[PDB]
Design a binder for these strands. Structure first.
Ligand SMILES: Nc1nc2c(ncn2[C@@H]2O[C@H](COP(=O)(O)OP(=O)(O)OP(=O)(O)O)[C@@H](O)[C@H]2O)c(=O)[nH]1
Lengths: 49, 105, 169, 1111
DNA sequence: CCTGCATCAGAGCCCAAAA
DNA sequence: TATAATGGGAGTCTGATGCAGG
RNA sequence: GGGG
């Protein structure tokens, strides 16, 4: 943890790389709704590397 | 922005005949101030070839048109009898501070 | 004496290798190679067989073996369970069955019915030529042909709905 | 630059060789460089002499020898080999029946050798053996807590070499003896020694009621043999009291110089305490067929005389460092050696019964397996044999001088209380009062004081100068704690004129108690302030100004400093940083006088006067245990003239021979916009630009290809279903090419393994048929890159079976190692600290244009919040900054020794001289005082900082002597409304770096029995949500959040599979089902024959196994 | 009846945990 | 499947409670 | 042994 003076009382700083893993199932579904990957299986293959 | 030394695959190498390690060599090339006389010129490539018991300075780079080395006295590598060195340094024009991980040139 | 039980005669052979190597180490002032033991054991023994014998002689280790000076860590805790499907894999298997049936019906159900019987979703009904004599609906050489047109229409139908490529890992 | 040294103390002796506690202990145990006939009876030699001759037939010991190591140190580290020497022993077999003598030299296995710097190589990894403090053997007398006028005498021998004894005097009046926690009357044992009522009456009797209370008539009614049989029935109920059996038991327990060992220190302490002289290390003897007492009567005699209040009898303080001794490497190893030798003897005696009493030599009679296992057991698994701390050279030097009260033969964690953890008065000059772990281990683990050395008996000694009359000699005497308490010891800083004590009143100690004394009464004097503290504590300048709790953190954290590519020594040193590099062995020195012939990146060749052209190869980029780069750099040029002991190459974290744990940065002490909050630190982007606080780190990756029952694992470039984009940086064989950038997910070494009977399910069969690709025989097992790691591939080692010199563990075809390096720039979340215990994480990196700056345009480097100083009471950092300010402008570095240092006035002189350069330059350059400098001066005179009514130069210099300057905010341009403290501080980058610590998991590996996520970053584990965390969720009443933690996010299998499927389909997660670790609980209670039944509201059974477990 | 006296079951959390 | 062989080797400190004993 |  690191201090974040600029945050409002209800906020925290979350590293993007951490957030991608924690929300990974959500990220896969959303990547199909818009269009970054054809389906859920291919989207996961893309985040691996 | 970039260095290719002959017979060197990466930054952590060391050159026979040279006192300085490659980390220090790149550290010295980071102090090189290179002025472009022609405003249209965005990139060049300086060449250096040295041997024998000499202390290579910034002057020893092979001269290129419309580029003046403002600090020709800067020390680069100390070479010893039998020590060799052939490199290509790419110098660019840009703004601010761009770290090595960012440009990857 | 062993968690993995060993035939009494085989235990005798293992003990022989031990004594033999122990002599060999006492004359040589250092550990013998597999080859030095294979020579000392006589004919029939090469270095390869000495190693395989040692592999067989390895005793298992406790899952409760402590790691560290704090008494609060077990070896078994560092061992994944490889048997049960992971959430990703279980999810994948459900999704694969769902695309597979939703794919044999988009040609025809009946040419899907002939092909589906020739492998089986949750059964595994692959023979080769005899058994296929009964109920598909046709006689017997014909099912090999509709197997190809089912497989052929599937192949063309696949290039458009190329969603099944990624399941090849 | 110039180096200005303060302090008036002339240290009569230098610090001893700092790793000598390790080197000297083991060299003494092995005596490898001594010819066998000239060996003293100690260490390995003493173990052999103790175990032999072996009785039935007799096997006798002649001598041992140690060979040379099969492989050198570098080679051992490479191949995961132990650095060791072959041990042989010459034995002569004697037949007690016949006369036959066969003699042969038998091979006992290998013994590990210690390197030059005091460490070991065990299976390829460098290791350290930590010394163990414990109670010294001897005879002690402590007060009995229950009866305020009685005492217990305890006879304690060396660990595992005998029982503990208690001599309590019971309420009935008879003196009782306690052995193996069982009690009986001591009078009975006295009769076995052949004592009669007369001897006890005449010897003692003087104490009217005590000596008569020991007298028991029934015991006297029997000659010494009958009394021995009587006692044995008390100690071993049910065992028939055969006369040879009883003698054997009592002899082995009491008189046997094999089963009972008092120390060598035990003998001295016993002889000195009771005023007797011991013939050996045993409590009694077997002589002329009966037992003859040695210790017991003098110990009984001292106890009675003590209870009576006889002059010359005192209780012993058991934490005094005279009664507490250190067990060093040699002694610890020798104890394990002695056990292994005795086990081998069991094999000898048992083999001297079976298989023919004649056709046996010594070579067939000895099986060395018990000895080899005991030594291998000690080095590979003892809890005193530790993975070396080699983060930086100081890390390992400190590690080797540590003292542990824990381990095999000492306190446990649950078994330990206050008396042992305290700082005893005798710790003065011997054990450092500062350097100890914070937390549960406080006081159990300590560090050897700098001038202390451990004597032959194991007591820590410290130097003092003799004082005769009032004149201080140069003769130094190393004293134990017991001997130190006799004299009056003056402080090291007491004023001197020449060799004479120059003060009328001196500050001294008598038994640790501080006392003021006249120069006529002064017997000894401290050698130096340095002798009181550890090596790390001695590296903290201005230590006299720091609160102890913070000084501790300063010491411990220097151990954690990461070697930096630009590393520099601090501008304020203590004068020890030169010695530490030299004793550590990290750098490199010239053996004799000579001239440098050649200087290379890889090597330095020196031509000496001898004419020999000694070549010193340099260690370049070697990976330490903690992954910091140990690398040596050449400091001399071709043709440079060198003398003996001059520097050739600098080691890691050293600069021109001085310890460099960090960098010297320009610091401003001031709040900054809450980026300073609660110890966080703000740094200038200028630091990364010029590569300050950048360090090289290497992580090691390894993979084996082994034989399986399904076929060979193969390391190949051919990996099923992978594109050429994925394989580009792999060589022909499937190994990544040296000099490639690899990032997470990338393949390092390609490998295939043969597919299990999972030989593809019919679902996969039909899919494979559609694409017309045969399901391959092998699957992709390639070694890749963990999340968050990666770098440049700098090396590869490949080891197969059937290549010269290599044989792997059974079944393993080949082992591949890939070494990957990374250059780490300082970043947000990396941790910094100075030597006074101010420590914090980098929370903000501002661009240089935002950094506060001096009037002449120079921006500061670090901004530290002043709120960290007052509660912490570590002021050395403040004085460190001021002297650092002067040094920034005068171009100098300082040596300010501890407790004899730069004092405030002397620093002021130096600070004034700097102001001339900071200002006089300006007045000559044609600039006058600034408008904003006046506004600050206005505010400063309201503060009483400057005197009203002086020119701006006069006032600015007044502020500069208080170490304060005018500071402009780079955002506004306006001044800070007050003068701010600014100067040069030494700050280190510690080993805790976010790149190593950041971790997250969606789903991942599970445990076998519980089906819950694994632990730890390396396993891709989940976080532990424990008992107290559940309470947190409970007190909030968040039930569905809590239930998720207990089911879908852990071991509920149906739920977690179903929950993942829902998130990727956009549906909401399902209501959870029964957690699998509860089903385990149910079945485990059934294994205990308890019926656990889940019931509905109607009291009918509910089946949570859904029919699977019922017939 | 009451009191010594033993045998037993307790001794903070999370992370690295370098086997 | 046969001289006769016949009894072992080894290691803190707290508070609560159910027990043989002046 | 090390981090809070
Ligand atoms: N329970 C527990 N807490 C620990 C442990 N180690 C460190 N801590 C934490 O360490 C913190 C100590 O914080 P301090 O810096 O001393 O807090 P403080 O009262 O403000 O003291 P100052 O900062 O000097 O003013 C506590 O909040 C603990 O939670 C540990 O082993 N166990």
């Amino acid at each position: 943890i690191v201090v974040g003076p600029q945050l409002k009382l209800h906020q925290c700083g979350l590293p993007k790389r951490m957030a991608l893993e924690l929300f990974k199932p959500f990220l896969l579904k959303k990547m199909e709704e818009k269009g970054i990957a054809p389906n859920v299986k291919a989207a996961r293959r893309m985040l691996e590397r | 922005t970039s260095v290719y030394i002959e017979d060197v695959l990466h930054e952590f190498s060391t050159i026979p005949g040279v006192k300085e390690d490659v980390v220090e060599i790149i550290l010295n090339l980071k102090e090189l101030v290179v002025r472009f006389l022609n405003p249209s010129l965005q990139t060049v490539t300086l060449l250096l070839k040295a041997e024998g018991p000499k202390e290579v300075k910034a002057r020893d780079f092979l001269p290129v048109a419309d580029v003046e080395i403002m600090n020709p006295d800067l020390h680069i590598a100390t070479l010893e009898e039998g020590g060799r060195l052939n490199m290509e340094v790419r110098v660019d024009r840009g703004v601010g501070y761009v770290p090595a991980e960012k440009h990857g040139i | 004496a062993r968690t993995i039980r060993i035939p009494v005669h085989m235990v005798e052979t293992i003990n022989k290798l031990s004594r033999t190597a122990r002599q060999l180490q006492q004359e040589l002032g250092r550990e013998p190679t597999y080859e030095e033991i294979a020579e000392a054991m006589g004919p029939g023994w090469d270095a390869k067989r000495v190693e395989e014998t040692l592999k067989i002689a390895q005793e298992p280790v406790s899952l409760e073996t402590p790691i560290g000076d704090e008494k609060d860590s077990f070896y078994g805790d560092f061992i994944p369970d490889e048997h049960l499907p992971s959430p990703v894999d279980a999810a994948t298997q459900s999704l694969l069955s769902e695309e597979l049936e939703k794919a044999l019906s988009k040609l025809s159900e009946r040419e899907a019915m002939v092909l589906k019987l020739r492998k089986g979703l949750i059964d595994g009904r692959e023979h080769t030529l005899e058994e296929v004599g009964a109920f598909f609906g046709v006689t017997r050489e014909r099912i090999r042909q509709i197997e190809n047109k089912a497989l052929r229409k599937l192949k063309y139908h696949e290039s458009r709905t190329r969603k099944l490529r990624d399941f090849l890992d | 630059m110039e180096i200005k040294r303060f302090g008036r103390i002339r240290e009569v002796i230098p610090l001893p060789p700092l790793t000598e506690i390790q080197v000297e202990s083991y060299r003494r145990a092995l005596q490898a460089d001594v010819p066998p006939e000239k060996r003293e009876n100690v260490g390995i030699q003493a173990a052999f002499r103790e175990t032999f001759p072996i009785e039935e037939l007799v096997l006798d010991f002649l001598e041992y020898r140690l060979g040379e190591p099969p492989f050198p140190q570098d080679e051992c580290r490479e191949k995961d080999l132990t650095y060791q020497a072959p041990l042989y022993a010459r034995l002569q077999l004697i037949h007690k029946d016949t006369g036959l003598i066969k003699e042969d030299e038998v091979f006992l296995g290998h013994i590990p050798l210690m390197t030059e710097d005091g460490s070991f190589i065990i299976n390829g990894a460098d290791r350290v053996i930590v010394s163990q403090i414990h109670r010294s053997p001897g005879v002690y007398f402590t007060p009995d807590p229950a009866r305020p006028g009685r005492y217990i005498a305890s006879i304690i021998p060396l660990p595992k070499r005998g029982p503990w004894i208690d001599l309590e005097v019971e309420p009935n009046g008879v003196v009782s003896m306690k052995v193996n926690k069982r009690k009986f009357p001591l009078v009975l044992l006295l009769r076995v020694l052949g004592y009669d009522q007369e001897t006890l009456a005449r010897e003692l009797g003087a104490y009217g009621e005590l000596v008569q209370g020991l007298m028991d008539e029934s015991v006297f009614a029997m000659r010494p043999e009958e009394a021995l049989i009587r006692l044995f029935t008390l100690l071993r109920p049910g065992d028939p009291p055969k006369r040879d059996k009883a003698v054997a038991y009592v002899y082995g327990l009491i008189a046997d110089p094999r089963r009972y060992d008092l120390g060598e220190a035990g003998r001295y302490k016993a002889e000195e305490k009771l005023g007797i002289r011991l013939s050996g290390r045993t409590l009694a003897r077997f002589e002329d067929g009966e037992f003859k007492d040695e210790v017991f009567l003098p110990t009984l005699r001292y106890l009675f005389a003590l209870t009576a209040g006889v002059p010359g009898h005192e209780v012993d303080d058991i934490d005094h460092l005279g009664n507490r001794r250190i067990r060093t490497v040699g002694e610890l190893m020798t104890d394990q050696f002695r056990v292994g030798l005795a086990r081998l003897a069991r094999g000898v005696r048992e083999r001297m019964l079976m298989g023919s009493e004649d056709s046996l030599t010594p070579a067939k009679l000895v099986n060395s397996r018990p000895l080899e296992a005991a030594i291998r057991e000690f080095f590979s698994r003892s809890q005193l044999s530790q993975f070396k701390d080699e983060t930086n050279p100081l890390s390992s030097l400190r590690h080797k001088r540590r003292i542990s009260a824990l381990g095999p033969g000492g306190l446990t964690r649950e078994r330990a209380g206050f008396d042992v953890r305290d700082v005893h008065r005798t710790h003065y000059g011997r054990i450092c009062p500062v350097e100890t772990p914070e937390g549960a281990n406080i006081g159990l683990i300590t560090s050897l004081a700098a001038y202390a050395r451990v004597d032959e008996l194991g007591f820590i000694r410290t130097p003092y100068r003799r004082v005769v009359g009032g004149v201080v000699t140069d003769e130094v005497v190393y004293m134990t704690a017991t001997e130190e308490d006799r004299y009056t010891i003056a402080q090291a800083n007491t004023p001197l004129e020449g060799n004479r004590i120059a003060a009328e009143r001196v500050v001294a100690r008598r038994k640790g108690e501080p006392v003021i004394v006249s120069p006529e009464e002064v017997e000894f004097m401290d050698v130096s302030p340095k002798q009181v503290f550890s090596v790390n504590t001695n590296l903290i300048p201005f230590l006299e100004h720091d609160d102890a709790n913070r000084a501790l953190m300063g010491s411990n954290m220097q151990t954690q400093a990461v070697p930096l590519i630009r590393a520099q020594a601090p501008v304020v040193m203590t004068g020890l940083e030169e010695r530490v590099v030299r004793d550590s062995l990290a750098a490199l020195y010239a053996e004799e006088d000579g001239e440098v012939a050649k200087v290379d990146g890889n090597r330095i060749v020196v031509r000496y006067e001898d004419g020999r052209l000694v070549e010193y190869p340099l260690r370049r980029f070697y990976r330490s245990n903690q992954g910091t780069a140990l690398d040596q750099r050449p400091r001399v040029v071709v043709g440079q003239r060198v003398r003996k002991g001059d520097l050739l190459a600098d080691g890691p974290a050293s600069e021109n021979g001085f310890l460099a744990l960090g960098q010297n940065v320009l610091v401003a002490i001031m709040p900054f916009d809450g980026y300073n909050f609660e110890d966080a630190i703000v740094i200038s982007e200028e630091l990364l630009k010029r590569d300050f606080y950048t360090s090289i780190h290497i992580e090691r990756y390894e993979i084996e290809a082994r034989d399986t029952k399904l076929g060979p694992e193969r390391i190949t470039r051919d990996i099923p279903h992978l594109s050429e984009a994925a394989l580009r940086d792999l060589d022909e064989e499937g190994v990544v090419r040296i000099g490639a950038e690899v990032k997470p997910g990338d393949i390092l070494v390609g490998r295939t393994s043969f597919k299990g009977e999972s030989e593809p399910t019919p679902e996969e069969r039909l899919l494979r048929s559609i694409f017309g690709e045969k399901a391959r025989d092998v699957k992709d097992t390639s070694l890749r890159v963990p999340p968050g790691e990666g770098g440049i591939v700098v090396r590869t080692v490949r080891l197969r079976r059937g290549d010269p010199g290599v044989e792997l563990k059974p079944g393993v075809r080949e082992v591949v190692r890939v070494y990957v390096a990374q250059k780490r720039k300082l970043q947000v979340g990396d941790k910094l600290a100075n030597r006074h215990g101010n420590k914090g994480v980098v929370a903000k990196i501002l661009p240089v244009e935002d950094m506060p700056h001096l009037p002449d345009g120079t921006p500061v480097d670090v901004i530290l919040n002043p709120l960290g100083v007052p509660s912490r009471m570590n002021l050395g950092q403040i004085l460190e900054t001021h002297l650092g300010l002067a040094g920034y402008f005068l171009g100098q570095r300082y040596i300010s020794p501890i407790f004899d240092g730069a004092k405030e006035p002397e620093i002021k002189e130096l600070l004034a001289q700097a102001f001339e350069v900071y200002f006089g330059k300006r007045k000559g350059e044609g600039f006058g005082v600034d408008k904003r400098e006046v506004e600050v001066l206005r505010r400063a005179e309201k503060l009483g900082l400057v005197t009203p009514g002086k020119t701006p130069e006069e006032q600015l210099k007044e502020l500069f002597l208080q170490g304060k300057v005018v500071l402009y905010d780079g955002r506004t341009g306006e001044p800070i409304e007050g003068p701010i403290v600014v100067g040069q501080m030494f700050i280190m980058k510690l080993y805790h770096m976010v790149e190593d610590k950041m971790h997250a998991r969606s789903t991942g590996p599970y445990s076998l029995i519980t089906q819950q996520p694994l632990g730890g970053k390396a396993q891709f584990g989940g976080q532990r949500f424990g008992e107290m965390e559940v309470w947190a969720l409970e007190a909030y009443g968040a039930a569905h959040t809590l239930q998720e933690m207990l089911t879908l996010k852990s071991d509920d299998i149906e739920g977690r599979n179903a929950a993942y499927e829902a998130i990727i389909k956009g549906e909401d997660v399902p209501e959870p089902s029964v957690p699998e670790s509860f089903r385990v609980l149910v079945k485990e209670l059934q294994a205990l024959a308890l019926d656990v039944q889940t019931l509905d509201e109607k009291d009918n059974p509910v089946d949570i196994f859904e029919g699977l477990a019922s017939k």
